[model samples]
Every structure is written in C-alpha cells, then in structure tokens.
Target: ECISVKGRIYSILKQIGSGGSSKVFQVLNEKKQIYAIKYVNLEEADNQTLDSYRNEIAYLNKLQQHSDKIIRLYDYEITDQYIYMVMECGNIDLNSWLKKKKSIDPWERKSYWKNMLEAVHTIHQHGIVHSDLKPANFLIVDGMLKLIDFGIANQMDSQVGTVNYMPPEAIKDMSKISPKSDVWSLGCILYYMTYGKTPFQQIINQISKLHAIIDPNHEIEFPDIPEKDLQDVLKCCLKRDPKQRISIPELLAHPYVQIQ
Candidate 1:
C-alpha cells in the first residue's frame, strides 16, 4: 500500500535504486515536487539494522546545510510498515556518469573532484565520517555533484565501506578510520574517472590473498594524464598514510583546484 505524509499523498512511481536493507522510489508531491523516498522496512529488520537506517537519515539531515554536494533531506517519518525518508532527487551517480562519458575531460574531472573534496571537508568539519565514499555514492545533477547513500556511513570510528574504495587501514584494523581514509576513497574515484576502471581489479582477479598482500604505500601510476597539476592533486589525495595525506584546505589551495 502507498503512504501519505504531511497531507501529501505519495504514489509509488518507480524503483530508482535499492540497497541491502532498503529501496528508493521516485515520488511526486501534491505540488509536483519530485523527491527520492527511501523506505526502510522496520518490521523485517532487527533493532540494530533499524537504528543504522535512522542514523543515515539523521546524518543527512544534520549535514544538509554544510555543502551543496549532499542531497537535502526534507523530512522523515515512521509508520506501521516502514520508515520513510524524503530526500532531494538527483540524477545518476558518478559511476554511471563515468560509464557514459567513457573518460571525463581533464578540466571536468578537476571540477568534479574539487566539488567532492569541498563536500567531504564540510562533512569532516562537522565531526561525522562518511565511511562510504565512492563513485556510486556521488550523484550528478545539472553538471553538479551531490553525495548520497549513507547507509554504511557512521558517526563512530569503526571502519565500514566498500572494499575497493576503502583505505588500507580501514580494511586491516576497521577502527582507525579518519578523514584521510575518505581522501583515499576519493583517490580511487578520481582514478576511475580517468581510466574507466579500477587499478586493483586486475590484481584482485589474479590473487586469492589480495587483501593481505595489497599495500597502500605502493606507488600509484597515473594513466598517461596530460594535466600535470590534476595528477599532482590526485596523488596527494591517494597518499598511503593518513598523516601524510593532504588536508582539505591544502587540497583546496592546490593550483588545479583553486577557483579562479
């Protein structure tokens, strides 16, 4: 059955996406405002699962004013069947954008990275960690960026994010996560933007013990990039050690990202 919130009857439009525990729908309001509604079935989920779902919504609501890169949360409500979260509707994510564009132009890539970094910096400034940072989580709309899907995101230091995009420390210890870890994931996104594939995927295919052998300290090779400053910025973001990684302010100051 469909649900109603705030005197507005929401009709189930179509399934836009799904995650491990919830489904997202594109819905229209009485005023014809489009929104992405995330429904978390609390009846079927454990307390911990439900809490996580709520936490993601809370996080988004709290950080909505920090940056434009985040999808704005309008309201949240819980009913007998499920918990409903109303969020700003955005276009396909960076992953899909990359797939369609094949390779982003160097200037376009820098612009996207800068916008993402600004958002990440804002989130970190608020003392919340978006443990899940990847191309799939970054939404693109009207040639702009918005981060979404904070299901695996947390307020604690515990490591939780995608394997391919996660930093080495997060994978090994699962407790030493920091903002730099997000930077590491950002580096992976940048790499994918340029190459149209992941650098570690080939190694993952060949090695059964890939996780144990993978070294974040190992040198990352750029794929014949023509823009030198952009390469430098990406390298700084991907540095192995969290301490060695560039700060958000430093990144903003970099020649490639500095807004003219």
Candidate 2:
C-alpha cells in the first residue's frame, strides 16, 4: 500500500523484514529514490515493546547526522496507530557483501574489517553500543560498511543481546553491561567472516550456546592467516574478560585495523 504523508506518497515496494513490533519495507517516492521505511503498529505494542523502537529511532537520529557509519534517517511520520521512519537503503548486508566477492582477498577482508571497526568506534564515541553485532546487521553503503538495527541497542543494557553473539558475562549476569561486551560479539562476527562459520556451534539453542561460551575450555580455532592480521584482532575481541578485551580505539589502532 502507498501511504501519503504531508504531501509525498511512499509506494511500498514490498516488505523487507518484520518482527519485534515493526515491519520494514523497501519504498520509492516521487523522486524515484529508494529508501527503507519501518512502520510500527503501536496498537499492538507494550511498554517494553514501545520503548525499543523509540530507542532505535532515537539512537539512529543521534548517530545519523554525525557519522556516516550508521544508517541515515531522512524523515519520519507519526499517527496514533502507527509510526514510520524513512531511511537510507543499502546494496548488501555484510554476509552478502563478502560472498559477492568472486575472489575474497586478504587485503579486501582487512579493508572491510577496518571499516567495520571505524563504524563501531564511531558509535562507541557517541556513547551507544549496538548490543547486537552480527553480519546481518552491517550493510554496504556507498562501498563502505554501515551498521544497522538498533532495536536492542542503548548506551547500555539491562538485558542481553543475540544469544549466539551475546557475551558470556552478560548471560551469566544480566544486571550490567560494558562496551567490551560488545567487542566479544564483534569478535564472533569477524571469526564467522573469516572461517565461514560461527566461533561456537551455530546450531545450538541460546542456553546451550551460552554454556559453550562460558566454558573455560571453549575456544575459536583460528586458521593461520599468513597474510592477515585479523588473527590478532579476533583474539583481543574474543577475550572473555571485559577488562581484558580490546577497547574500540585500541582495536582501531591495531596493525590489522590500520591495514592500508
């Protein structure tokens, strides 16, 4: 359905995604410009449900203007029954981005990894943690990586993130969170990218996956990447201790991230 707001009409091309209280669609306007629009049916929302979407919008607004690393929000409309936000759309998600490369090179991989770190650094500088860091949440925007999806993101969290990517400490104690917690998820993402599999058993349920995470003996076996410094980067990020994990700036300065 085409929805008219103010004086423009947005033709919903199709539903791109849905769940978590909102439906997102690829949209085209009078200018023929393509954008993504997320609509929330608030009538079906609860307090906790209502806040995350609003929090997502708020965080997007906060980062969009200042950093190119995050997706841009162009406009928004609100009605009693629904809320809609028009946003920048991208060519590919990280998973698709990596696979599209007919020949994935070490340099290209390092380049993408560096860009992702820059994006994460920018967000951390702005005092927000994406909470969920995975291949699907990062998209290719104008030949660069742009992190998306802030539904569960906040300056901090009182809860957990994606079971597979979520850190062991957070699962062990949901009472607190730290930026280093996010680093672990980023580590897992990088591991998956390099190995074509998640660091842990990807098929298991959250609880079982969590046990593997907290297990002292559990580890991600890294293949020898003779041409890539990502091996060093992953170890720092995958460190179980928050205090021991790499800080964003520290990650950015690593020889791997500093790769030209």
What local distance difference test score does each model get?
0.73, 0.75
| TM-score, cand. 2 vs. native | 0.85
lDDT of 1 at 53: 64
Q: Write the per-residue lDDT of candidate 1 for residues 54-79, one digit (tens) a residue.
A: 67667788878778788888888887
| lDDT, candidate 2, 205-260, per-residue tens | 77778888877687667788774577888778888778878888888788876656
Candidate 1: 10-residue stretch with minimal lDDT: 153-162
Clashing pairs in 2: none
